[PDB]
Structures are given as C-alpha cells and as structure tokens.
Amino acid sequence: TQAEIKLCSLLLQEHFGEIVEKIGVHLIRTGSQPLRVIAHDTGTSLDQVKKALCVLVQHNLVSYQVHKRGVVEYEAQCSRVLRMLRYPRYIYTTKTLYSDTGELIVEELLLNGKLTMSAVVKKVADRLTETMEDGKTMDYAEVSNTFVRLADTHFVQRCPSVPTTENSDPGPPPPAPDDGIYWQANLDRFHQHFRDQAIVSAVANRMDQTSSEIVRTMLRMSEITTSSSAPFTQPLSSNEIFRSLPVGYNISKQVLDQYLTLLADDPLEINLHKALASLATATLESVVQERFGSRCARIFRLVLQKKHIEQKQVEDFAMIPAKEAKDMLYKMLSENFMSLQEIPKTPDHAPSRTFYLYTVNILSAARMLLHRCYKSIANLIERRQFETKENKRLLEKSQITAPERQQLETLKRNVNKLDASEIQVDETIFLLESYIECTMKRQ
Amino acid sequence: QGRFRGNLSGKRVDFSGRTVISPDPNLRIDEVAVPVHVAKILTFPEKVNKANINFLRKLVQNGPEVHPGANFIQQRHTQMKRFLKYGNREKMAQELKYGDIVERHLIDGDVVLFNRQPSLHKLSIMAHLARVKPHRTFRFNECVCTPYNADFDGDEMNLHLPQTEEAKAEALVLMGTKANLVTPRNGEPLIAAIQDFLTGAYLLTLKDTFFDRAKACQIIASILVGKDEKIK
Amino acid sequence: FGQKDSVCGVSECIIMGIPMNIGTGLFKLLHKADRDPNPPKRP
Amino acid sequence: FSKGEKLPDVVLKPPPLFPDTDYKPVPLKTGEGEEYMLALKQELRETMKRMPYFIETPEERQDIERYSDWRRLPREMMPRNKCKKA
Amino acid sequence: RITTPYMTKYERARVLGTRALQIAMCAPVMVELEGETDPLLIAMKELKARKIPIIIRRYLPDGSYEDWGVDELIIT
Amino acid sequence: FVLVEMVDTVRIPPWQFERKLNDSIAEELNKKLANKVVYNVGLCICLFDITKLEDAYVFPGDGASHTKVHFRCVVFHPFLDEILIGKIKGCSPEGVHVSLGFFDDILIPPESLQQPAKFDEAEQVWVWEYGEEIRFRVVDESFVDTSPYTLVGSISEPGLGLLSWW
Amino acid sequence: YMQRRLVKSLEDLCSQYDLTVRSSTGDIIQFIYGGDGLDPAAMEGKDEPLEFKRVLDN
Amino acid sequence: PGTQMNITLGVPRIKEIINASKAISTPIITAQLDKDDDADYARLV
Amino acid sequence: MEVKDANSALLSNYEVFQLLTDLKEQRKESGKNKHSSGQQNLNTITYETLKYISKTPCRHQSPEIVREFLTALKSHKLTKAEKLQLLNHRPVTAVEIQLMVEESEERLTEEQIEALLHTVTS
DNA sequence: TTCCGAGATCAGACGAGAT
DNA sequence: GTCTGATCTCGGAA
Ligand SMILES: [Mg+2]
C-alpha cells in the first residue's frame, strides 16, 4: 500500500509541517519504534522528535503502549491519517444535522485534536460572537445545550484513559482554572451517518422518494443500538415504523406496508452486508462507465450476473461483434477488473485446457480501485503543490499588469477545480472502504 | 567461460610471453635467460629520474632495433606514446626531459616472473632477474626446476613483466628465488641439485678421487665467473 | 535481500581492482617529511 | 516494422472521458472549508518552524525579525455522555 | 609498542615498493648514490643505510594503530 | 570579508619532498582556491593559516603524499550590511555597473531606489543630477555545471545624502 | 577442483598484527596461528623451530 | 600433495573429509577395551 | 574541499591587508616559474586586492589601533558587524556615521554619535 | 487430534593452459 | 551421466 503512504506524506505536509510529516511518515514505514530509535534512523535531533510526536499524539495519529521492555514503542495507525482528507465533509453534515454552532463544535474538535468541554465552548464563544452583531452577543448557554445534543446522538466520544507511563510526560501535550477531561470527535459515528446518506440516496435515486424515507427513519431510530461492526441493523417492527415517520408524510399504514414488503424483497435487499456490497459494484460500474464506454460497461455487468460462464456466451449475451468485444475483455483483464481464468483444470497447458472462463472478483477489483484512488489524490495535491510557489509575487500585490492578473484568475480557477475534485474522489473512498471494512473479519 | 571465472579473476595479461624452455647451468639460481627478440618486445616504462637520464638518452638513440634501446616515449603529459621508429631518435634524445616515460627494452637486471601453467603450489610463480641472452628459449638454472615441476622435454612456461615500480619490488622481495628456497608445506628446500649435479658431486666427493694441482686448479677455477671473478 | 556487502577479502578486491588488504596491503605507509600542526595568526 | 516508427504516442487519448466536476452545487460549502482550514492549519500553534534557517544565518543583527470580548458566564458540568472503556 | 619489532617481508616489500616509485619520480635521494640507474637498486641502498623517509602505519585489526619508523626496525 | 574553515586533501607530488609541508601545502592550496567563488560561501582569495595539518599518507598508487589539511582561508562575502566603496567600470541602461577596485568587476547594481532623477540613457550618463559608495544587498550565486556570473550581487544606493560628492 | 574449493574458502585469512588470525569479516578463527605463531616454512624438522642438537654443535 | 577390510586413503578420502559429508564410504570406529589380553573376552564385546 | 565552517568574521580590513602585505612580499621570495604552466590566478587576486584595501588609508594604520578602537567600541553597544563597518568604513566625517552608518535609528541620540566622531578620528 | 521421520525428485558441477 | 543437499509428499504415533 505504498500509494497510501504517498498520501500520508502529502496530508501532513500541507497541514502541520515537514518534520512532523517526516517523523510521522517514517513511523508509518517502520512501526512500533521507540523514541531514541526514531531520532537515530530519520536523522532528526531528539528535541524536534519530542515536539513532533507531541503534535502527533494531540491529533491522535500516533498511539503509544509498552509491553515488555519497559520502553514505550510509539505506533501510528495508518487509516486515521487519511481521514484528514474527509475533514471539510465532516464539517458539513454537522451543518445539515445541527446548527452553525454545533458545526463549529466538530470543527475545532477536528482541528485542535484533544479538547475539554471547558475550552471548546470558550473558543466558539469568541468565533461566533465576532461574526455576529456587537451588542447582540451570542449567549454561550445555547452552545452547552447543543454540545450535549451532539453527544446524546453519540457524534462525539471521549478519549480512552491515558496510560500515564513514566516515559510519557503529562505537561508537554496540553497547549498553554479547571482540568476537565479530553475528547476527540467520534468520526466512526460519521461513517455510519455518511453511510446513512449513502443508502438513502441509493434507494431514492432507484426505487421512489417514499421508499427512501422509511429507510432513513429505520436507520435514524437504529443509531445507538448498533455499531459499525454490526453485520446488519437491529430488527424492527412495522408498527413503530408508522410511529417514527416524519410529519411531512401522510401515507396510510397499509399502502406503505405494501411498499414495506416491496422494499424488503428486491435484488438490492435492512441488510447492511448486502447494502454496501451492492453499492460497491455500482461504484465499479460507474468507473467502467467513466472509462470504457457503455459497450464495455455492458459486458462488465454481464460477469456480475453469471459467475463462471464466459467467452462462450459473452459474444452472444451482448450481441456486440467478436472483434469489438474481445478488446473489451482484455482491457478489463489488463487493468485487473476482469480478474482471471480460475477454472482451467487441464494440466499445465495454455494451448490445451478446459477453456479459461472470466470471472469478476469483487474485492480484488475493489482493493485495486481504492489503491488507484489513493494514487489519484497524490496527483491532485502535487499539482496544487506545483502551482503555488510560482504565483506568490502577485498574491501580496493585492494585500499588476494584465497578464499578471490573468495568471491569478487562471490559478484560482485551477486550485478551486483541484480542491473540489479532491472531495469528489473522496466519496468513492468511503463508499468502497466501508465495503472493505464490512468484509474484513478479526479487525 | 563467464565473466566471473575467467574474465574477472583469470584475465589475460599484457607484457607477457611464452617460449619453450631449455637448460642453462651457467646462470645463478636467480636469473632467467630471456631471448633477444622477446626482450626487444616486452618493455618496462622507466620514468626519467636524474639517475637514468644519461642511461635512457644512451639507449633511445638505439631505438627499437639494437637491443639496449627503447620503442616508445610518452611525453610528461599523456602525449601518445611516440613509436620511436619513424622520427629522429637523437632529436627525441635531446628533447627528453625529466618526468616523462621511456618504454625501454627488457634489459638485464630487470625483474620478470615465471609461471608454469599447471600451477599447483606457491612456487610455480617465482620472480627472476632477467639477463638478455642470444636465443629464443627461456633458459634458467636447473636447480630451480622442481619448484616449477618443469622438465625440458618440450615444456613451455610463461614470463610476465611487471610494469609499475611497486610491483617490481613485490616480485623481487616476496617472490624472488633467493627468498623462496623453501616450500611452505614442510620447510624443506625445493631448490637444490637435480640429476647430474648430484651424481657429479657424489662422484667428486667419493673417497677414491685424487686430483693433482693440474686438475685441481682446473676444477676450482671453473667457479670464477659472474660476481665470482673478483675473489682471490 | 538488500545485501550491502563491504568490499573485503581478496575475491572482491581483485574483482573491483582495489589493492587487497591481505599481505602487503594490511598496513599503510606514511611519509616522514617536515611538518607540524603550527600556530595560527592572531585575528 | 509495423510499429518501428517512434514512441507509440506522446499520450493516448481515451474517446470517453470524465463526466464533469460531479456534485456541482453543494461542495461550494465544503470547498471553501478546504481552503479555510488550510489557511488556519498552517497559521496554527500545532506546526513547526525552520530553526535550520536560523542556524544557517551567521548574519544576525538588530532591527530585523531574525533578532526580534469573550462575553461568558461561569458554569461547570462534566458529562459522561460518552464511552466508559479503554 | 606491542607488535613485532622485526620488519616483516611484507613491510620490506612495500617500503621498497613505494620508495622505488618515489625515487622514480625525482625524489630527493638520501644515499649519495654511485651510478645505480635502476630505482629499485637505489632503494635497497636506502634501506641498508637506514635512510628512508617512511613511517609504517601498522593497523591492529580493532582499528587502533601503531606507528613504526623504518629507522626503528630490525631488517634482515 | 570573513574567515572560512575548510578541509581539503592536498596532494604533494614527490619531487617537492625537500620543502617543508606547511609551506608546500600552502603553495598548492593557493593554486586551488584563488579567484574562485565557492557556492553559498563566497569568493576565496588566499590562505590565512593552516590550523591543523594531519599525517602524510602515501597511497598504493601515486607515490605522492596526501595530507588531509584543515585550514582557514579569507574569503570575500558581503554581510548584507556593508557600505562598500567601488568604481563605475561600466554603465548599462537597465542599471549601472560598479566594480570594487581591481577586486571583481562582477557586482551589478540594479538602480531603482535613488532620488527621482534616475535614468541611464545609453550615452554613459551616470545619474541625472540632484570613488562611489555601494550598498551590497542580496547574496546570489548560481552553480555553473548543468550538462555533459556565479556571484553577481544586487547593489543599492539609498538616501545617503553623499555630502562630499552630490 | 579440490584445489579450487580449498582456495575459494581459505583465501581471505591473514595473521593480523596482534598475532590473531581473523577472517575478512573480522571474526577470529585462531587466537595465535597454530598455537605458537610460527611459520611452517621457517619451521625446522619435527615441527620445532630449532632442533637444538644441531645449533649447539654448530 | 593432493596432486602427488578396506579404508579409503587417497584424494577420495581427503575430498571426503573436506566436504564433511554426513554419510561417508567406509566409516570406521576403533575401540579399546577394558580387558585387552584375551581374544575370548573381546569376542564377547 | 568540503567547507566545515561557513563563517567566522572578525577579519578587519587592516588584518586582511596586513596578511596580504606579508604574503605578497613573501611569495616572491619563493616566486616560481615552474608553477606558471600550472596556476597564476592567485597572483592576480592578491595583487589587485591589495589596492582596494589600500584605497582605505590603512597605510599608516596600526595593529594596536584594532584593540584601542575596540576598547572604545564595547561601551557604545554597537554589534560586532556594526563595529567592523565602523573600522572598515572608517567614516571620515560625521555625515557617514550620522546618515550612512548602520542602526542610525533610535541609537543615534546626537550624543555618542558626536563622541564616535572623536573616537573615529582618533 | 498434529509432527516429525522417511519415503522421491531435483540441483549445479565435473582441473590448468596452450597451438 | 552420476554426486549432490533441498524441498516436497506420506504415515505411524502420544
Ligand atoms: Mg614435461
């Protein structure tokens, strides 16, 4: 997963600094490594490594635990570092589900890492009042009201109890009264909630508008009683479905009951195992639609129908000519979508065999496209890394000839086209990574 | 045949010749007789160093046809070796300054080193001082033939000529015949009399022989040539 | 394996064309000319 | 000989292409925050500085940088709305 | 001070090795020589007169060293 | 001007074994580092002292003597706070050329900052009026090797007043 | 062949200056060479450097 | 010198030793006894 | 030829000039034509360099003055770079210290600047 | 119940140099 | 055309 590590080098470089990236990315490359061993292998002085790990434990990227030697081996979790890419999307759904106050709550909780209640409410009392009218001061009591209102739906969970090992020092991590207790954001709750938007958009854009809302109210009343490791949601009765409907609807119980047995019986199938398994194939199909036209996408859906029945029917079952079809198979083979010939049983003969049958394997085509999408955002940021250092002469002139200004508006058209496009490929990551996490046992 | 076992370790070597050997007891154990035609070809780059300036001037007038001579001159700064056959040698003799290289012929007193090609022990390569004799055979003293395991029944053995002055001393000191008289298996001497000399000196030291001052001064005065001519 | 070998012995110093350290290349030689770590000038 | 002409092509053009800047309307909201926090993450306390510049500078001299209403009321509530583990 | 005070045959070879090549590049000769034109024959005249401007740097194999002047050694 | 501590492996050829090393290294090191700008360092001039000279090896090839030499050499490197005194050895319409006296004619002042009577109009007009002083302002050196100048300066002239000469 | 296998393992040993015999990698094979540190070449008959009867009569 | 009942003694013995093979041809273990004065007792051993 | 220490400046113009004056007159004692086919760039830099330093009337400048001026300088609180400018520039008149001199802002006071003219003249 | 012993098959190599 | 250790498959047992 080298392209994954390419992003963690890119994500820390833009956010904090360079040595916090370097000591950071080395720890991703060599793992459970002590404090002196990290400073000797990266060639970094020990005073800067203590600072760089201090920022890294604050934003919860490096976790420390000692087992046997009495010497703490730091360890960085890889998949947390890529969640910085989703950071402005984590802001936005707290604006759709909470006000501007609580949206700023998850913001400075994502920004400054570990926060106590006594600090984060004091900070938003500065930012929200300075943008509101002076003399019309925003009262902080409503912040404490919406602060717990996030926590009752469990969007913010507290930090695990600190080990307080001798090697670890308490004074350095806090940045400089009451002590309180710290927390990060519960971004795992978001990955339910981002999946809640994913299934409700999967039904509404396929079945009907009224079908999706009963999926939403099913999932909105199954939030605390499940977790992300739940194979499917908690089972509900249809009578509390009629109780939990929104007030915008007026549908009679028996007609929605017909839609309830309609929605329960589909090819799609609430089976949370089958939901992410069906949404991932549409993400695959939207990539071949993006890349190889509707004709090759037509045979790409054909192998998702029959598992191992190929090349004696695919020239027939899509009616496209043998010349035009077989270049689409080998292009789906060479780009690892078509997977392979796992049926040949004649012994050691490419020429004489029982005829190789194509078969898509959904996860090998998944893990590649996730590795491809990790590679994709490397080419996005590095371009925005490229176009920045040249144009610095004219950013401060506003703070100017006609080609001088024209380079700026072609820059600002470019960066805003790049930065918007970092997020549109980001929604493909989570839609596929949640499918990856759903088929992974013992993790 | 590959590059490891035959091109990186066992690689072919310039300044090296090969003839048939024939005996010569009239040399010291440390000297090989080198033919003239070979000694005019194998050359030693002797740099000019205030002590061989008149000696190299004297031999560069001879050029590559008379034996104590030379056939290449580099100038002091990587000028191409000047094949000393076409031009004026005396104009190259007078213009010869310090520092530059003369590739003089294999002269007597130079250090060549033998090898008999099935090398089985340390003693198959040995250095030898080189005296330019008049023939095309490599002639050495027959005491040093059991280290080479070399009989004279049509056997050939190679003669390398070390070029740098550091590799000339490493031949003379380490690999000279006066140093390696003794094999490193036992400590026994390998260079000692073979065949006729043993049956010569047995028949001489046998109890029955008696020489008068006729034959006594004749046998004794055989031992007076070549570093031995100046002793009473 | 990422095998970093140093170049020692004789089967590698002959291949690389380094003077081998076995035998005459064990030690090294200095020169005995007139030298000393001298005093500097006052600045 | 059929391909022995030049590098295949400088680039290979795919007749079908990318759709658009997909999800056009709503990522105006996230897209400014992409640039908003990056304006504030770089200008934060949680960053490092190039002290290798200052050890590189032997030209240190004076007169250069190299040389040089929260309206709120008290309360205290500590909630265990969160997990009791780890 | 701990190694052998005898000049080995590998030290006599290289001292004669490089004092020959030094004197074949017009080095100053220390023995007021008597017509020897072979630079190697000058160097053995330098050794027997014990005038060679060379100090042998003897490496103990741990990495420590021990110097030895060629004046300060017992040749054979 | 500034001292620069440098370390070099100086090879004395074996026909100089009569002379003392610390002199005969110094004759080599002047031929190695004179009139040569070192990148990010400045214009070396000559040898100040040899602060530490360590032991003369002699390698298996050359037969020469290679002494690793620690030394100090004086170099030319303005400190971005120096008011120098040079001479105008040239006038270009984009900016004047000043030269320090027989030192280096490679200091090229851009001219935008003196009093609003500034132009060089190709008939060698120095300045439209109201030894020459100079303020060296930036360090700027470009490493030359690029395929199979180099300390140029930018030089200013603020409102000094220049009481003696305008 | 047996000459070749022998010398392709045994070539990189030399008696170092503190009388130890080490490999090329620094590892010690012998602490003194052969117990006494004596040349077999210079060694006298009976594996003894002197053979004292001969030297005393000499 | 390599160039120069049954037990192997030649070069195929020295080649057999240098290889240090696990199984050799003609391996022989000699053994001294406690009572080495009578053929009947060593018969019994 | 790696440079270990990039900087270490206290070489006042007199120091460098003096070193060059001893060097120029000392190199000619051993001046060589053997090395002409090799190196001659050294001669040019030293020769011309002497003249630019000579421009400053370090002719009649003395070694003791360096400490004597320095003893006065330490009281003023000017930085080491500033003092080197003060010795090397050798401001002839008040206007250079008054205006040309570095760190004029604040520290001028029209007090020690007047005193400096007496010290610089000395 | 698994694991280690003993049955098959597989490797790279088999001196210098010379015309 | 064998001589070779390595590395794979079978099988009987605490
Ligand atoms: Mg024969």
Curated annotation (Swiss-Prot), chain A:
A GO MF term: DNA-directed RNA polymerase activity
Any one annotated GO CC term: nucleoplasm
Main location: nucleus
Top-level taxon of origin: Eukaryota
Compartments, as annotated in UniProt: Nucleus
Keyword set includes Nucleus: yes
Consequence of substituting residue 291 to E: Strongly decreased ssDNA-binding. No effect on interaction with POLR3F, POLR3G, nor with POLR3GL
Keyword DNA repair: no
InterPro entries reported for this sequence: POLR3C_WHD, RNA_pol_III_RPC82-rel_HTH, RNA_pol_III_Rpc82_C, RPC3, WH-like_DNA-bd_sf
Protein keywords: Antiviral defense, DNA-binding, DNA-directed RNA polymerase, Immunity, Innate immunity, Nucleus, Phosphoprotein, Transcription
Location of the region described as Disordered in the Swiss-Prot/TrEMBL record: 160-176
GO biological process terms held by the UniProt record: defense response to virus; DNA-templated transcription; innate immune response; positive regulation of innate immune response; positive regulation of interferon-beta production; regulation of transcription by RNA polymerase III
Family: Belongs to the eukaryotic RPC3/POLR3C RNA polymerase subunit family.
Something else known: Antibodies against POLR3C have been found in the sera of patients with systemic sclerosis (SSc).
Name of the protein in its database record: DNA-directed RNA polymerase III subunit RPC3
Organism: Homo sapiens
High-level lineage: Eukaryota, Metazoa, Chordata, Craniata, Vertebrata
UniProt gene name: POLR3C
From Swiss-Prot, chain E:
Phosphoprotein among keywords: yes
GO terms of biological process kind: transcription by RNA polymerase I; transcription by RNA polymerase II; tRNA transcription by RNA polymerase III
Principal subcellular localization: nucleus
A GO CC term assigned to this protein in UniProt: RNA polymerase I complex
One function term, GO molecular function aspect: DNA-directed RNA polymerase activity
This protein's record includes keyword Transport: no
Compartments where located: Nucleus; Nucleus, Nucleolus
Alphabetized UniProt keyword annotations: Acetylation, DNA-directed RNA polymerase, Nucleus, Phosphoprotein, Transcription
Functional note: DNA-dependent RNA polymerase catalyzes the transcription of DNA into RNA using the four ribonucleoside triphosphates as substrates. Common component of RNA polymerases I, II, and III which synthesize ribosomal RNA precursors, mRNA precursors and many functional non-coding RNAs, and small RNAs, such as 5S rRNA and tRNAs, respectively. Pol II is the central component of the basal RNA polymerase II transcription machinery. Pols are composed of mobile elements that move relative to each other.
Family named by the database record: Belongs to the archaeal Rpo6/eukaryotic RPB6 RNA polymerase subunit family.
Name of the protein this chain belongs to: DNA-directed RNA polymerases I, II, and III subunit RPABC2
Organism expressing this protein natively: Homo sapiens
UniProtKB/Swiss-Prot annotation, chain H:
Tissue distribution: Expressed in the brain, in the cortex and the white matter (at protein level).
Signal peptide annotation: none
UniProt-reported outcome of changing residue 13 to Q: In WDRTS; uncertain significance
Cellular compartments annotated: Nucleus; Cytoplasm, Cytosol
Disease tied to this entry: Leukodystrophy, hypomyelinating, 7, with or without oligodontia and/or hypogonadotropic hypogonadism: An autosomal recessive neurodegenerative disorder characterized by childhood onset of progressive motor decline manifest as spasticity, ataxia, tremor, and cerebellar signs, as well as mild cognitive regression. Other features may include hypodontia or oligodontia and hypogonadotropic hypogonadism. There is considerable inter- and intrafamilial variability.
Membership in a protein family: Belongs to the RNA polymerase beta' chain family.
Function (record text): Catalytic core component of RNA polymerase III (Pol III), a DNA-dependent RNA polymerase which synthesizes small non-coding RNAs using the four ribonucleoside triphosphates as substrates. Synthesizes 5S rRNA, snRNAs, tRNAs and miRNAs from at least 500 distinct genomic loci. Pol III-mediated transcription cycle proceeds through transcription initiation, transcription elongation and transcription termination stages. During transcription initiation, Pol III is recruited to DNA promoters type I, II or III with the help of general transcription factors and other specific initiation factors.
Primary gene name: POLR3A
UniProtKB/Swiss-Prot annotation, chain I:
A cellular-component GO term for this protein: nucleoplasm
Single GO term (MF): nucleotide binding
Subcellular location, record wording: Nucleus; Cell membrane
Biological process according to GO: defense response to virus; innate immune response; neuropeptide signaling pathway; transcription by RNA polymerase III; transcription initiation at RNA polymerase III promoter
Domain of life: Eukaryota
Tissues in which the protein is found: Ubiquitous. Most prevalent in testis.
UniProt keyword annotation of Transcription present: yes
Membrane-topology descriptor: Peripheral membrane protein
Keywords assigned: Antiviral defense, Cell membrane, DNA-directed RNA polymerase, Immunity, Innate immunity, Membrane, Nucleus, Transcription
The keyword Cytoplasm is assigned to this record: no
Its job: DNA-dependent RNA polymerase catalyzes the transcription of DNA into RNA using the four ribonucleoside triphosphates as substrates. Specific peripheric component of RNA polymerase III (Pol III) which synthesizes small non-coding RNAs including 5S rRNA, snRNAs, tRNAs and miRNAs from at least 500 distinct genomic loci. With POLR3H/RPC8 forms a mobile stalk that protrudes from Pol III core and functions primarily in transcription initiation. Pol III plays a key role in sensing and limiting infection by intracellular bacteria and DNA viruses.
Similarity comment: family membership: Belongs to the eukaryotic RPC9 RNA polymerase subunit family.
Protein name as annotated: DNA-directed RNA polymerase III subunit RPC9
Protein's organism: Homo sapiens
